[PDB]
Amino acid sequence: DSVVDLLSYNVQGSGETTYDHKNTFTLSCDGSLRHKFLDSNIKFSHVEKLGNNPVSKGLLIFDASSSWGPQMSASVHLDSKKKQHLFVKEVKIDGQFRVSSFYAKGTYGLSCQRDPNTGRLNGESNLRFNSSYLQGTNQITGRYEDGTLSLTSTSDLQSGIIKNTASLKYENYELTLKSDTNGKYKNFATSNKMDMTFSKQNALLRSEYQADYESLRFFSLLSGSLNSHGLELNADILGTDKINSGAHKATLRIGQDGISTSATTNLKCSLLVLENELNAELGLSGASMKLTTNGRFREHNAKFSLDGKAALTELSLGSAYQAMILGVDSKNIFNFK
Amino acid sequence: ALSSASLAHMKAKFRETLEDTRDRMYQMDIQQELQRYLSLVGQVYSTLVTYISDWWTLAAKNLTDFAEQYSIQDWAKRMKALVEQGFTVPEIKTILGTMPAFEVSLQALQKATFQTPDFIVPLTDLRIPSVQINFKDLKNIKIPSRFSTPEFTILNTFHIPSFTIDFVEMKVKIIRTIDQMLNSELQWPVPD
């Protein structure tokens, strides 16, 4: 208390906490900050019943009104009861905040309905966020019926310009996750559907992607799977456009028999053809290689091959190449054992 | 090299060693070893109680005799008050529950009387009271053979029912491992 407004203030707060031996609980957290720039009014309720009917309740009332333009508010409502034996829980949380011209609001709603008699659960969630320059909207649902889970995910990114949907499946100890992500910004016709599934020994691995920008119809494929004996994987990448086309195929065989791979690449540039092929096998009988690549430009061509056989009994390495480049008869014979 | 004239003694000795080893691991079971350890702990505890009971009296007599000549009886009285009386923590009222009052001294440890905590875990089917524990006799006190978890609910969403974690299962598994190891002998390796 003083003749100065800025010197005079009020700070106070209640720290109530009561436990009755009836397994009864009570919490009060009060806050009131009385000042010339901000008028806080904080109060939270939380009462719990540790005896029969374990009802969970919680109320937050947040009122911090500033005397300079920013006006903050939020309230938390915690509703968790035991409907006869069915357990009903409701969560209502809202956060609302503006200063002078900027808007910020994200609302939320949660509902859970579980059946302990049968292990069935019904979980439902809602998300909506609204801002001055941002829009948030999401929904999550799930169905856990005693081991069988049915999870579905979806969201709306900036009014859904970017779509993301997910699907989770886990039944009879077999995981399965499926999801999609797509883009609707400018010419970016992006669309990826990642997929993954699991088992006791194998877990299939597949993925795709399409860029689809203007005249670029790019594609890439990833295909592989896992076992206790080897790892097969195949990456297939295709970048095609109006005139040129980028074609590559990657083949990877891994097993106890031997190491076999095939990275096949071809390119087509109008009057130019170049193809890029290898045969690399690595088994217990020895390393055998083969290289295949020919240069087709207009008419002048450069045909080349290369083979190899690394074996303890005998080594087979031969080379030969010929071309008609500029009318010149270029040729070599490079073979030796 | 493993079946020559000087190897029969080695084979017989290894067979005898396997038999004696099986005899010993027939004894280092779960409940057998638990009972043996508890009995040994109780025996050594009783012997230590007797020895400390003798030594406290002897040291008190020595201290009294020394103080009756050097006029230092005040320190002897202070030490006797600090050791014989110790301190009595009263009943403690906490979230876990009501802890009975206990005195930490020399005689309370001589008598081997422990008050276990009397706590009530919320949302549980099993309660643990304040059980008197005697350290001199432990072969018959608190024998973990049959234990089951109470059913409990967390976050009002995760309800775990009762699960019987019983040491007979582990004892059976150990005996099976014993039999499997004994059945496996070490001989010359196969060409495979």
- For residue A81, the chain B residue with the least C-alpha distance is B156
Would strands A195-197 and A258-269 be described as parallel, antiparallel, or unpaired? unpaired
Using the Cα atoms of residue B141, residue B142, residue B146 and residue B150 in order, give the sign of their dihedral.
Answer: positive
Backbone angles phi, psi at B35, to 5 degrees: -65, -45
Q: How far apart are the first and last CA of chain A?
A: 107
- Look up tokens 């217990």; give the residue: A284
List beta partners, residue A287.
Answer: A282, A310
| B176 φψ region: left (φ > 0), alpha (ψ -120 to 50), beta (else) | alpha
Backbone angles phi, psi at A89, to 5 degrees: -125, 130
Distance, CA of B107 to CA of B104 (rounded, Å): 9
Token pair in block for residue B73: 């009886």
Question: A153: burial class by Cβ within 10 Å (0-12, 13-18, 19+)?
Answer: middle
Task: Check CB contact under 8 Å for B156 and A121.
Answer: no
Which approach determined this entry? Answer: cryo-EM
Distance, CA of A270 to CA of A263 (rounded, Å): 23
Q: Are A87 and A105 within 8 A, CB to CB?
A: no
Distance, CA of A24 to CA of A14 (rounded, Å): 19
Q: Are B133 and B141 within 8 A, CB to CB?
A: yes
- For residue A19, the chain B residue with the least C-alpha distance is B95
Fill in the amino acid letter for B25. Answer: M
Distance, CA of A47 to CA of A18 (rounded, Å): 9
Cβ-based neighbour number of residue B176 at 10 Å: 10
Question: B8: burial class by Cβ within 10 Å (0-12, 13-18, 19+)?
Answer: exposed
Distance, CA of A203 to CA of A184 (rounded, Å): 32
Distance, CA of B154 to CA of A115 (rounded, Å): 15
User: How many residues comprise chain B?
Assistant: 192
Distance, CA of A287 to CA of B40 (rounded, Å): 68
Buried b (16+ CB within 10 A) or exposed e, A33-56: eeeeeeebeebbbbebeeeeebeb
Backbone angles phi, psi at A220, to 5 degrees: -135, 135
| B66 φψ region: left (φ > 0), alpha (ψ -120 to 50), beta (else) | alpha
Cβ–Cβ contact B127 with A under 8 A: no
- Look up tokens 């990657």; give the residue: A250
Token pair in block for residue A115: 């059946």
Name the packing angle between helices B8-25 and B167-183 (round to 10°): 180
Nearest by CB to residue B156, choosing from A23, A50, A87, is: A87
Q: Are A238 and A218 within 8 A, CB to CB?
A: yes
* Cα angle A272-A277-A279, degrees, rounded to a multiple of 5: 165
Q: How far apart are the first and last CA of chain B?
A: 19
Distance, CA of A239 to CA of A262 (rounded, Å): 19
Would strands A272-283 and B132-133 be described as parallel, antiparallel, or unpaired? unpaired
Contacts of A25 (CB under 8 A, 6+ apart): A18, A19, A46, A47, A48, A49, A50
The CB-side HSE value for B177 (13 A sphere, CA atoms) comes to 9
Residues of B whose CB is below 8 A from A119:
none
Token pair in block for residue A260: 């076999």
Distance, CA of B179 to CA of A100 (rounded, Å): 80
The Cα-based distances of B25 to B2, B21, B35 in angstroms read: 27, 6, 15
Backbone angles phi, psi at A149, to 5 degrees: -110, 130
Distance, CA of B53 to CA of A113 (rounded, Å): 65
With helix as H, strand as E and coil as C, how does chain A read?
A: CCCCCCCCCEEECCEEEEEECCCEEEEEEEEEEECCCEEEEEEEEEEEECCCCCCEEEEEEEEEEECCCCEEEEEEEEEEEEECCEEEEEEEEEEEEECCCCEEEEEEEEEEEEECCCCEEEEEEEEEEEECCCEEEEEEEEEEECCEEEEEEEEEECCCCEEEEEEEEEECCEEEEEEEEEEEECCEEEEECCEEECCCCCCCEEEEEECCECCEEEEEEEEEEECCCCEEEEEEEEEECCCCEEEEEEEEEECCCEEEEEEEEEEEECCEEEEEEEEEEEECCEEEEEEEEEEEECCCEEEEEEEEEECCCCEEEEEEEEECHHHCCEEEEEEEC
Token pair in block for residue A90: 């409701």
The Cα-based distances of A128 to A98, A157, A210 in angstroms read: 17, 11, 30
Question: For residue A237, which of A249, A229, A255 has the smallest C-alpha distance?
Answer: A249
Give A141 to chain B, closest Cα distance, Å: 16
Question: A11: burial class by Cβ within 10 Å (0-12, 13-18, 19+)?
Answer: exposed
Token pair in block for residue A263: 């990275």
Backbone angles phi, psi at B128, to 5 degrees: -115, 105
Q: Are A316 and A309 within 8 A, CB to CB?
A: yes
- Look up tokens 């080695």; give the residue: B10
Give A315 to chain B, closest Cα distance, Å: 31
Distance, CA of B161 to CA of A201 (rounded, Å): 31
Task: Check CB contact under 8 Å for A50 and B122.
Answer: yes
Q: Are A78 and A59 within 8 A, CB to CB?
A: yes
Residues of B whose CB is below 8 A from A116:
159
Distance, CA of A313 to CA of A316 (rounded, Å): 10
Distance, CA of B21 to CA of B161 (rounded, Å): 41
Task: Check CB contact under 8 Å for B156 and A116.
Answer: no
- Look up tokens 């087709």; give the residue: A296
Distance, CA of B152 to CA of B158 (rounded, Å): 8
* Cα angle A236-A239-A244, degrees, rounded to a multiple of 5: 135
DSSP string of chain B, one letter each residue: --SSTTSHHHHHHHHHHHHHHHHHHTTS-HHHHHHHHHHHHHHHHHHHHHHHHHHHHHHHHHHHHHHHHHT-HHHHHHHHIIIII-EEE--EE-SSBEEPPEEESSHHHHHT-EE---B--TT-S--B---EE-SS--TTSS--SEEEEPPEEETTTEEE--EEEEHHHHHHHHHHHHHHHHH----PPP--
| Best B93, B151, B156, B158 residue to mutate vs chain A (most A CBs within 10 Å) | B156
Distance, CA of B96 to CA of B102 (rounded, Å): 17
Task: Check CB contact under 8 Å for B159 and A56.
Answer: no
Distance, CA of A320 to CA of A301 (rounded, Å): 15
* Cα angle A38-A42-A43, degrees, rounded to a multiple of 5: 165
Cβ-based neighbour number of residue B86 at 10 Å: 15
Distance, CA of A179 to CA of A123 (rounded, Å): 20
User: How many residues comprise chain A?
Assistant: 337
Token pair in block for residue A141: 């649902």
Q: Are A65 and A41 within 8 A, CB to CB?
A: yes
Question: For residue B43, which of B135, B123, B181 has the smallest C-alpha distance?
Answer: B135
| B71 φψ region: left (φ > 0), alpha (ψ -120 to 50), beta (else) | left
Contacts of B6 (CB under 8 A, 6+ apart): none
- For residue B95, the chain A residue with the least C-alpha distance is A19
Question: For residue A49, which of A91, A86, A94, A18 has the smallest C-alpha distance?
Answer: A18
Distance, CA of A189 to CA of A281 (rounded, Å): 39
Residues of A whose CB is below 8 A from B156:
54, 56, 80, 87, 89
